[PDB]
């Protein structure tokens, strides 16, 4: 904690500050890019921003797309991982690692938020549940 | 891409020659359009899209 | 589009359960048809005991039997037996040898012809169908004498358990045509025993080589046929297993499916509306 | 091309002149059917004239239905398909043959727009893309 944020917008939000904690986050470990050090942040299950941004989104009354979602919820995550970045020597050489995290129902990588994200990051770490299951710990498919 | 298409055009009809035109993922000039007709008042046409998809 | 799954489910799951018939099927004629195939394996002994054991003895003639199942389902069992045939039939292969290859069971005639195919004679099939019988053995052991070679080769699976039939090739040699003369060193070993046959011993061999290969043979389609019914038990112990996991990736689809047609229904409904108020 | 017309709209004309084109088409094709002569009408892709009329109809604020389609989009395609006949002699004895070409998307026939013109027509070619590549060319099922 010596070298931690930790940024929380809980269970019980409000679906606006669920909606806006992960950019909240990424303000401030974009100081840490921008003034020439490196950043690291972990958006712990980004699929429940996108379903904080879903409840706001209908409670809007703006059109529902593919599984619910609004249509620009491929933006929120997209302007979100953007962001981090490794910046040039004439912009202080700062960089910012991002861990979005994205919880899968029952393996089905084929999912709109999950097909978002993964076209947005440069790769992934999938963990997979028989391999959970049989102890294989971290179950890196 | 309409950009992207005008500096492919210029190539196409002035120098008149032939152009290569690469577009990564012309789908999200569809999804964009999609964004962007939710608040223009439309009604929206299958799974989510603009009428004039 | 959601109804081809649905009936895609109902296939894979009526295969599943027929595949689990099956296996219990299987294991059912496995049990029932191995307290007569330890009970024929007594009578090999004293052929083995008397004759002994000569697989590479150089023939001139030379008869080979595959003994392989009829029905199909038993997971590469005659293929294995098809493949052990050229790998014992080339192993006799030292003078240009002439060889007849004969297939016991039909899924063998079928498998010889496309590695030997000019060496192929006869094809004895419908052998499961009722039970084996030591007549029928005899049988065969007749149509094999009618042509008569130096020597024998009987291939099958011996029904060690449940789990393992690693196979066998049992070798039966023709009276004094070739199998005395694999006897004598110093003087002989048959020469031990009194021959108490009402003629020569050239044809006390002569019978006791006709009834050694009905008993080879015998038993050879009789431990096949239990090895058989254990490979089917194991083969479709996997079938369930795959129409199992097939069937669930399936359901998975499924749920998949149905909750995006009430989400898509829902969708249009709201749509609806909105545009009249 | 003697005996050709070719009426031509395609993805960059507006809305309306794709809704319309197979009307358009049907009346140039009427004239041979009403004076004695004999008519072969393909409209390719009804269910490209279908679309063009479901942006016109959403457009226009008229309230969607089936996958967003207005409620008159069977008597869209009815009061087209109708209008190829056999006239009886006393008209003349002239024809009109009708190829309505309809895609589907998976095979799946049970959609809106293809269930509509399967009950409007009276037989059905039915090409599959599993025949397609078996070798079995045309495809038909």
Do not use: W
């Amino acid at each position: 904690m010596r070298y931690t944020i930790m940024v929380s917008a809980t269970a019980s939000d409000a679906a606006p500050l669920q909606f806006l904690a992960p950019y909240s986050g990424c303000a401030m470990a974009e100081y840490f890019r921008d003034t020439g050090k490196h950043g690291l942040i972990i958006y712990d299950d980004l699929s429940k921003q996108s379903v904080a941004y879903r409840q706001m989104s209908l409670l809007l009354r703006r059109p529902p797309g593919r599984e619910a979602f609004p249509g620009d919820v491929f933006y929120l995550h997209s302007r979100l991982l953007e962001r981090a970045a490794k910046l040039s020597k004439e912009l202080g050489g700062g960089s910012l690692t991002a861990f979005p995290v994205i919880e899968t129902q029952a393996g089905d990588v084929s999912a709109y938020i999950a097909t978002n994200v993964i076209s947005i990051t440069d790769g992934q770490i999938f963990l997979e549940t028989e391999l959970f299951y049989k102890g294989i710990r971290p179950a890196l498919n | 891409a309409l950009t992207g298409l005008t500096v492919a055009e210029y190539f196409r009809d002035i120098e008149g020659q032939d152009v290569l035109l690469f577009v990564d993922n012309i789908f999200r000039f569809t999804q964009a359009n999609s964004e962007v007709s939710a608040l223009l008042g439309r009604i929206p046409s299958a799974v989510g899209y603009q009428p004039t998809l | 589009s959601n109804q081809a799954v649905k009936q895609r489910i109902r296939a894979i799951k009526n295969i599943g359960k027929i595949t689990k018939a099956m296996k219990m099927v299987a294991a059912s004629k496995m049990k029932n048809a191995q307290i007569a195939v330890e009970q024929s394996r007594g009578l090999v002994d004293p052929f083995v005991r008397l004759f002994g054991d000569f697989p590479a003895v150089n023939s001139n003639k030379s008869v080979v039997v595959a003994v392989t199942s009829d029905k199909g389902l038993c997971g590469g069992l005659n293929s294995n037996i098809t493949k052990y045939t050229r790998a014992t039939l080339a192993t006799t292969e030292s003078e240009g040898k002439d060889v007849v290859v004969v297939s016991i069971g039909d899924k063998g005639r079928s498998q010889l012809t496309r590695i030997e195919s000019q060496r192929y004679q006869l094809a004895i099939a419908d052998t499961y169908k009722v039970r084996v019988t030591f007549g029928q053995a005899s049988l065969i052991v007749e149509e094999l004498i009618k042509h008569n070679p130096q020597s024998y080769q009987i291939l099958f699976n011996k029904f060690r358990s449940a789990i393992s039939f690693k196979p066998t090739v049992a070798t039966i040699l023709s009276p004094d045509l070739l199998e005395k003369q694999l006897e004598d060193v110093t003087g002989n070993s048959l020469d031990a025993y009194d021959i108490e046959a009402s003629h020569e011993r050239s044809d006390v061999l002569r019978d006791l080589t006709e009834f050694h290969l009905g008993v080879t043979l015998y038993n050879a389609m009789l431990e096949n046929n239990c090895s058989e019914h254990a490979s089917r038990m194991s083969a479709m112990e996997n079938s369930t297993k795959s129409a199992g996991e097939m069937l669930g990736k399936l359901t998975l689809d499924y749920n998949r499916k149905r909750q995006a047609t009430i989400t898509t229904e829902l969708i249009e409904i709201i749509a609806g509306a909105s545009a009249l108020m």
